Ligand binder design. Structure first.
Ligand SMILES: [Co+2]
Ligand SMILES: [Co+2]
Ligand SMILES: [Mg+2]
Ligand SMILES: [Mg+2]
Lengths: 206, 207
């Protein structure tokens, strides 16, 4: 019933980013949020710690007009309270390492909707900042689009949440924090439903 | 109980590649296999068509020594029955479009273990070949590592298959065809087990 027992020692951390384009190498990271998870004594999964940041475009970054028009972000607005990617990621890694230790896990794994995209941007931001001992697995992820495809027959975030009986407010859809929170509740509902129906533990079916 | 109903019209196709390195843009594709899926009238999921190819390294391709040592592949061996990437993918795409049409789906979705890797490579190969109307979704995948994590609490292919009660022969682990077939069976047993436990369809829980 321990978190470290559930995914062979992977510590699931839910992540969402907003960006200034599709290229993780060249395009700015603009927002990032992170939610760690915990299991209670009965082995039920729920959100734990929540972090969120507006991120300043890195020096030399590209910004796609079409991307800014899509997500509504204006990185030039001095009232957005941006911090550096270094500051944002450094804080996330600190919280994540602490969770990993506390829970007895060995490595963090990113949980995200269409996880490749977010993984790519987070890793590149990590590399730009020269952060040491990145707690996240360098290529494994838990894509909630695929998990929802299985659990709920839906692959789009908003539709998956709806099918799962969750609220989803589209006016908040371009916010990394909102998306991260909805995805965390979504992931937990999928893991918990699996357990509740007798799919886990593997011994439970008998 | 229709395949097209199961994943909002995504036609799932299991894929595995073997490569001459980690870079999808610059490293050679060396093997690729593909297995389409079908559902019976009761809604159970199983393999349909199987394809497999040894792939000739594309002109200008990089080949990492460490990658060849890892997977045991020697691209210079004239007995390996290699075909061009164009030929391999053209034939896979043809089988896939036919399945999509036959089943009434709208697009194919790649099923693979650590699917981003395979997706990157397949997309790059399609692009090198100038293939039109790629049946596959440009970024969505069904990663079986993540699905196995949920279903079986395991993320490594061989361990996942074992936990699922499947055989897994490590001497065949570097073969795209073998990996694809194991991954197809794994995916199907995960989908089928969810249905049989009463997790699908969504209305089953109250009947
Ligand atoms: Co940055
Ligand atoms: Co090729
Ligand atoms: Mg997102
Ligand atoms: Mg593979």
């Amino acid at each position: 019933t321990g978190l470290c027992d559930r995914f062979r020692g992977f510590y699931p951390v839910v992540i969402d980013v907003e960006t200034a384009g599709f290229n993780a190498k060249t395009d700015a990271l603009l927002e990032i949020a992170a939610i760690t998870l915990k299991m209670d004594e009965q082995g039920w999964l729920m959100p734990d710690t929540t972090l969120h940041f507006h991120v300043e475009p890195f020096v030399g970054a590209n910004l796609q007009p079409e991307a800014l028009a899509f997500n509504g972000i204006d990185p030039n607005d001095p009232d957005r309270g941006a911090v550096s990617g270094y500051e944002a990621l450094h804080e996330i890694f600190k919280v994540v390492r602490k969770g990993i230790k506390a829970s007895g896990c060995n490595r963090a794994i990113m949980v995200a909707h269409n996880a490749n995209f977010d993984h790519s941007f987070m890793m590149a931001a990590a590399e730009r900042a020269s952060l040491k001992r990145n707690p996240f697995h360098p290529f494994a992820t838990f894509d909630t689009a695929a998990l929802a495809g299985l659990a709920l027959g839906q692959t789009v975030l908003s539709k998956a949440c709806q099918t799962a009986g969750m609220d989803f407010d589209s006016t908040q859809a371009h916010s990394a924090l909102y998306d991260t929170e909805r995805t965390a509740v979504l992931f937990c509902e999928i893991v918990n439903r699996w357990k509740r129906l007798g799919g886990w533990p593997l011994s439970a079916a008998e």
